[PDB]
Amino acid sequence: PIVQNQMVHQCISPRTLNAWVKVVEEKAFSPEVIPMFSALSCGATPQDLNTMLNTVGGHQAAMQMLKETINEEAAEWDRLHPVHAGPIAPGQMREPRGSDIAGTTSTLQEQIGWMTHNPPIPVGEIYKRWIILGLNKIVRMYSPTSILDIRQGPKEPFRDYVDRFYKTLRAEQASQEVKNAATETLLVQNANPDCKTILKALGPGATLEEMMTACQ
Amino acid sequence: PIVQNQMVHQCISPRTLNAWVKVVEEKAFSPEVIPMFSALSCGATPQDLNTMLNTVGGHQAAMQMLKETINEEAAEWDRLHPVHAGPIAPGQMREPRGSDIAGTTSTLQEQIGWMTHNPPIPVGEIYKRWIILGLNKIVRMYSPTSILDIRQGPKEPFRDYVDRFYKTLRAEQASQEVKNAATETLLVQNANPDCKTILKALGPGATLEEMMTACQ
Amino acid sequence: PIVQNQMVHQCISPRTLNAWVKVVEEKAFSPEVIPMFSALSCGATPQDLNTMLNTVGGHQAAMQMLKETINEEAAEWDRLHPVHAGPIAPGQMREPRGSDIAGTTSTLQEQIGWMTHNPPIPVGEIYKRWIILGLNKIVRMYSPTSILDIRQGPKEPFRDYVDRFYKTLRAEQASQEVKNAATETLLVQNANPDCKTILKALGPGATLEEMMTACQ
Amino acid sequence: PIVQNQMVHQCISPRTLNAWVKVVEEKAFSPEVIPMFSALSCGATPQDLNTMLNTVGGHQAAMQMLKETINEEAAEWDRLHPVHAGPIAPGQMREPRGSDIAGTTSTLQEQIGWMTHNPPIPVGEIYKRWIILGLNKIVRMYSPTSILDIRQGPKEPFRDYVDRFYKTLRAEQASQEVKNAATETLLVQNANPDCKTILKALGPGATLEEMMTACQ
Amino acid sequence: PIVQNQMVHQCISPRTLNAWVKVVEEKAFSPEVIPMFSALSCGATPQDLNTMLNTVGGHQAAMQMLKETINEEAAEWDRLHPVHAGPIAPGQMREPRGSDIAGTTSTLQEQIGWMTHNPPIPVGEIYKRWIILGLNKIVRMYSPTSILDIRQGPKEPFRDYVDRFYKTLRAEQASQEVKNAATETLLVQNANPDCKTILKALGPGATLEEMMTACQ
Amino acid sequence: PIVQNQMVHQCISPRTLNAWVKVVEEKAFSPEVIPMFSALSCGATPQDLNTMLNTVGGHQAAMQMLKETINEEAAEWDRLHPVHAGPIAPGQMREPRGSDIAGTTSTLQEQIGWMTHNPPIPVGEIYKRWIILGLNKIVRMYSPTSILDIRQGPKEPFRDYVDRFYKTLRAEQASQEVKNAATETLLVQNANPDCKTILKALGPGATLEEMMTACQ
Numbered sequence A, B, C, D, E, F: 001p002i003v004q005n006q007m008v009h010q011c012i013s014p015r016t017l018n019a020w021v022k023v024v025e026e027k028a029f030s031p032e033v034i035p036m037f038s039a040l041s042c043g044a045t046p047q048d049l050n051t052m053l054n055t056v057g058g059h060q061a062a063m064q065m066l067k068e069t070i071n072e073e074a075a076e077w078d079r080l081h082p083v084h085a086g087p088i089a090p091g092q093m094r095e096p097r098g099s100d101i102a103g104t105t106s107t108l109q110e111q112i113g114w115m116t117h118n119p120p121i122p123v124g125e126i127y128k129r130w131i132i133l134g135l136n137k138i139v140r141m142y143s144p145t146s147i148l149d150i151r152q153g154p155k156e157p158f159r160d161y162v163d164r165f166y167k168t169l170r171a172e173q174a175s176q177e178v179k180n181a182a183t184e185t186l187l188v189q190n191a192n193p194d195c196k197t198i199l200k201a202l203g204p205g206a207t208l209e210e211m212m213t214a215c216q
């Protein structure tokens, strides 16, 4: 990555490389893997971002969908920021293309130059955005269960049902508005008869704390 | 986080990310997880605090109650510190809102600016307070056992009973006044007949050391 | 803790937090846990000392006896160093109370101010002393076996007997004078008949090396 | 390696040495091992590159093919950059040969001199290129399965088939053009009858996301 | 310990504390534990040396013999370097006693003062010498087998016999002169008849390499 | 070791000490242990080199052959660089002897003085050379199998045979000339009849890549 002490390139650490590989091995495309990807790639160059994706041995269908997302974003970058086709000014910073941000057509030195310019051209953060957009599509793709089939079992603790409910909603990537809203509708409709009766009785404007307390 | 050598942003470490994920995996919302959360989030930006919460794959009912606690606190921040609605002074520090402290509407650069201002606007510590208040509600919620059902078994060592007693009291979050007070009342009432007889005999003003020595 | 490079606050490390939690999990209140507590808390602020104690999930009877020891010491600090009750001199160092040393009524900034004053008011070391005094009472409390029941088995190697003997004496916290003295008395009385005969024959002023060599 | 704080030699870390040995033990010449080799050898001298290859205990047929690749590249370096045969200018930088880049005929000091010259003679990066070219030949060699035998099982989830497909294609080292192209041909021909029918129906210009969604 | 960047006190690391505890748990007083003790205590203060010994939970007979060795050495230090009994010169370095070197009567600050004086009074290294002398007595004590009972089995590879032989000799702490000398005498006498015949035939002045090659 | 930030002594790390001990425990005198020894001893003083060898608990026949190799090299150093026998010039650098390089007769301070002189007297690297020469003799000694008994099994994959072949050749320490030469002779003679027929047909000047491809 690029770190302080002034802004300089540092080798990606064995600890970082290993954490990323292990999390994918243990968690595949469970949603929590995305924020972990983001955090492990703090200060990453495009090269570092390619390194972490390349070190993954499985999930090559995901990696191939991911490349499709990156080309779409690359093409929209190029549509928005076309670069003049002439030869570059001797010893001057060339403008980055989509493929330069994705690190397919840029060197580490070019990447350093952009990310440490004043002001920075933050190619690391631009590419991380493309990748995370791509990873989110995959999370949703690999979400195995519709929220509509998350229903509380006759003998299932309400807390365990809410855990499954909100885990499913996270993979299906319903926004926060739909997370706080489902609280007074689908969460209750999908509750078992006993709890549903208690939750109906509470009235509307019940916090999730109040609902969860109410169903024991 | 933000650390010295002057005050600068540092990437959250793989060691830190992994410790937090593991403690939640092993301990869920056992009370000792909260002080561990606090310590692992030493110097954290709002972004870092969101990162540690986001990296958690389970407990999504807790994470959703947590968001409710954060909105209540956000709203009370906004009620107490309203921000002028105008466009910002070029290159000047804007005042943070509830949502800026919770890191939903603030950038890392804004967060750095606040936390490294002279004097600091300590948005990291303000948000950690909201989160810990939220986590404590959850600890109490997930405390499975009333102190009233913690009673010493006929053949249970007094020390093991006191361990269960004070573990339960910690999850139920009785204050220190009620921890030092329960010593001369509920701890004795909940003791087995043999030990209760010994503890009655000691008289009042017996230290817990004295009680525990007295019951072998 | 507080460390050099000048004296500055540093976050307690994940490695430190984890070592302390694990040692308590593996060793409970075996005496060797105390010197390990001391070493893991090198340079600790009162806050850090509370952090390490708070991160412990079990042993809440011990943690509650510990608080009793800390209040006694707090009260003796207050008896010895009363603080004037007036409002503080603007931007000046207030004097610490018992509760400020125990970190219940002091901020991290106050704690830093004291421990980095010239000369230091070493609140970290004052509190570590209180805690270790408290932990030693607990070690002795949780010592399961009187030295008087440590007797060499008919077929037990003398070395294994001496190991049990001096382990017991450590938990029971006999001073060094009583450790070097027990050598020519209780160690011999508690030996098996065969070894006792050999040890009687050696005469007095036999080193433990000489005794252990003598009993094969 | 060579790192900043100015450009200086640093010992290869135990963490780095161990990561490389373990990845080869776990993954042999699975393609993801190459980008991991590249990342673990960030800032490496030729000596460091020889160190990581030498620390490998198995795969000596691979290590011997690797040496053949390195001699071919060494010979092409020498063909392109012949060095004058005279004795060197006292205290001056000699020009590197193939064998000097491969670290068989160069000292660490010479390697440091080249890699830290202004501008650098980047012998570390030149040698890493030779080695990675050699490692890629081996990956392809050790790829056990033709893409032509990757066909979706009657009851095999389309996602699992695509994973095998694109894993195989990676080991066989088909370029990106042939990865994005196989999408509308061999991936579909190799699908099971049910999915093939669905994929035929989609028409051409279907994204892999669209195909994978379409086959459930 | 005391380290450079000028000479300053550093906290003993969790990694160091844990390595020492584990090596004693795994290896007890096998001779290789002593050089490991020495290396783990690089730059140690007397306090650090007491910390590593105190963190050991077993082997309290050894720890008690160790204290006897330390008092003997302390007494010989005092016999050789008596200290004037007067009160100290305000703000001046007092001379260390045996008990000050063993860290029983000295503070960390005093220890720092001595070890960082110009020239250093190297109390860390003086105490490490006493301790290692004490640990060596214990290694020999706990050596279970006389070299005289190390004899090659009828079917035991000569290499395995030599391994047992020289392991035993190390615990029994025969000097290097007696290690290189035993080569042409006891090693051969203790060999099995077949190998003994081969070794007799070699003649004297045979290297251990030559002997080991000769016996297959 | 000795490291930069100017050239200064650093404690050998717990990580380094542990890596070396573990590699010997897992790999004994498999050839790959030597380059790992070299890499773990980067910047080592003679003292550090003795520390790593001393920390090894087994293989005392090897350690004793090793000492014989070190004395031979010590004696050749003394034959080549005799030292004047007079008393040293006050506060001046004495010349090192064989035994000073092997760290038996030199202090750490003397070792630092030599290795940090301008120019350096590189006693660390001189001793590492002696040791590695000694370790290589042992690797060959402990190589269990002649290359002549490495023959491809009727049903053994050619790749697995070549792996055994070149592993054996590495332990037997045939030079690179004999590794690249054995390719067109012994590798083919030792192949099974089927593969031998294919390899004979290829003709001479076949790469190992070509041979391995040819035998499936």
Ligand SMILES: O=C1CN(Cc2ccccc2)c2ccccc2N1
Pocket (backbone or CB within 6 Å): A050, A053, A054, A063, A066, A067, A068, A070, A071, A102, A103, A104, D176
């Ligand atoms: O090296 C790389 C480059 N890219 C970007 C890319 C984008 C589109 C097409 C090819 C490559 C990548 C994307 C995803 C996984 C791994 C990688 N590995």
Ligand SMILES: O=C1CN(Cc2ccccc2)c2ccccc2N1
Pocket (backbone or CB within 6 Å): A176, B050, B053, B054, B063, B066, B067, B068, B070, B071, B102, B103, B104
């Ligand atoms: O990213 C985030 C932001 N917040 C604050 C928030 C507060 C209220 C509503 C939405 C978000 C959060 C809170 C809890 C767990 C995870 C997260 N993750």
Ligand SMILES: O=C1CN(Cc2ccccc2)c2ccccc2N1
Pocket (backbone or CB within 6 Å): B176, C050, C053, C054, C063, C066, C067, C068, C070, C071, C102, C103, C104
């Ligand atoms: O936060 C804390 C504060 N104290 C001191 C205290 C002293 C007396 C009464 C309450 C608190 C403490 C003591 C022991 C274990 C954990 C803690 N945790």
Ligand SMILES: O=C1CN(Cc2ccccc2)c2ccccc2N1
Pocket (backbone or CB within 6 Å): D050, D053, D054, D063, D066, D067, D068, D070, D071, D102, D103, D104, F176
């Ligand atoms: O030491 C080395 C040197 N080389 C380069 C070399 C190149 C060609 C011939 C001999 C040596 C090497 C290559 C591959 C694996 C290990 C090593 N180990």
Ligand SMILES: O=C1CN(Cc2ccccc2)c2ccccc2N1
Pocket (backbone or CB within 6 Å): C176, E050, E053, E054, E063, E066, E067, E068, E070, E071, E102, E103, E104
């Ligand atoms: O704290 C200590 C002090 N000493 C030196 C000592 C020397 C003689 C008598 C008492 C103490 C010690 C020696 C050995 C193991 C542990 C320790 N722990």
Ligand SMILES: O=C1CN(Cc2ccccc2)c2ccccc2N1
Pocket (backbone or CB within 6 Å): E176, F050, F053, F054, F063, F066, F067, F068, F070, F071, F102, F103, F104
């Ligand atoms: O301390 C040491 C010194 N030497 C050199 C030596 C050389 C020859 C004779 C005695 C000692 C050594 C050599 C090999 C293993 C361990 C060690 N340990």
